[PDB]
Design a protein around this ligand. Structure first.
Ligand code: NA
Length: 330
């Protein structure tokens, strides 16, 4: 089997991407944030504290003929941005892009933090990191990908995120029409439960490539590119008037600037992030200070190849017995 679903930016900045997901019988379609940095499929629901729901579509298990309470199971998750959610668990039928899993754990939120409530466009998360990170207690649950894997034509999914445009998540196949050149594969460590890999270095604009190992994670659920402070300083030093602002929470730059590209290495291959991808617009409405898309990972404890980086590539998440990542230009 295979699946193929379009993923759509939630706003004009590509802050996140939503993908429609069918849950239950008859189908209830919710727009979920596919997150390769976490391992819980959780949804706004008929159980979510009413004051914490503001515009989201909710899953109502009582209206699904295939829903079953997973008795005694609870979940609670905290993300890198400080957001959180928790609740109880149902099993139900879940379909993505025509690919169906029966018996998927659907984590029903009883509580969500303010950042979730305030984002009316995201109805929940669908985690695609390794199932070792799933938070369900006392019986850990599998991700949608891990439950689908054995049925897929190939044990893979691909992320093809758009720049200010829709893109695609495919399950079970490589679309050889979706990228240019060849795919360069690189080793993955699953030790922390992430799609963790080592970039071979970077370049700023037309500058020389610096060969250096940068361990980080491929995380579709993180907007920005978070790299070591040395690398990030070298990038923003090429932008007149850029500075790190403790008041704003990162590097800002004059909105009048033209940003340089950023290149990262994948083995001997190179992925180029256009300068435009690194502009996250005014820090507040009408400001002439703009927020940068490359930020320091210092204090986060890991480097994160978030959407800024991933949307410059066609990315293969290879879940074979030895997992690997692949990157191609597009
Ligand atoms: Na922000």
């Amino acid at each position: 089997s295979t699946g193929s679903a379009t993923t759509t930016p939630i706003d004009s900045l590509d802050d996140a991407y939503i993908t429609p997901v069918q849950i239950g019988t008859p189908a209830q379609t919710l727009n979920l944030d596919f997150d390769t940095g976490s391992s819980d499929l959780w949804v706004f629901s008929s159980e979510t504290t009413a004051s914490e729901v503001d515009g989201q579509t909710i899953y109502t298990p009582s209206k699904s003929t295939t829903a079953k309470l997973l008795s005694g199971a609870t979940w609670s998750i905290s993300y890198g941005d400080g957001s959180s959610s928790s609740g109880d668990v149902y099993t139900d039928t879940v379909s993505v892009g025509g690919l169906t899993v029966t018996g998927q754990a659907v984590e029903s939120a009883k509580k969500v933090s303010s950042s979730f409530t305030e984002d009316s466009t995201i109805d929940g998360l669908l985690g695609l990191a390794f199932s070792t990170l799933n938070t369900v207690s006392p019986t850990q649950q599998k991700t949608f990908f891990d439950n689908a894997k054995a049925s897929l034509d190939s044990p893979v999914f691909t992320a093809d995120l758009g720049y200010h445009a829709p893109g695609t998540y495919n399950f079970g196949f490589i679309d050889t029409t979706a990228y240019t050149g060849s795919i360069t594969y690189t080793a993955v460590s699953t030790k922390q439960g992430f799609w963790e890999w080592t970039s071979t270095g970077y370049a700023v604009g037309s500058g020389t490539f610096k060969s250096t190992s940068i361990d980080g994670i491929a995380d579709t659920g993180t907007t920005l590119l978070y790299l070591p402070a040395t690398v990030v300083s070298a990038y923003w030093a090429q932008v007149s008037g850029a500075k790190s602002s403790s008041s704003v929470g990162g590097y800002v730059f004059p909105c009048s600037a033209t940003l340089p590209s950023f290149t990262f290495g994948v083995g001997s291959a190179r992925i180029v992030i256009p300068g435009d991808y690194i502009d996250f617009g005014p820090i507040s409405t009408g400001s002439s200070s703009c927020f940068g898309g490359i930020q320091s990972s210092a204090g986060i404890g890991i480097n994160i190849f978030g959407d800024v980086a991933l949307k410059a590539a066609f990315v293969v998440f290879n879940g074979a017995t030895t997992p690997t990542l692949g990157f191609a230009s597009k």
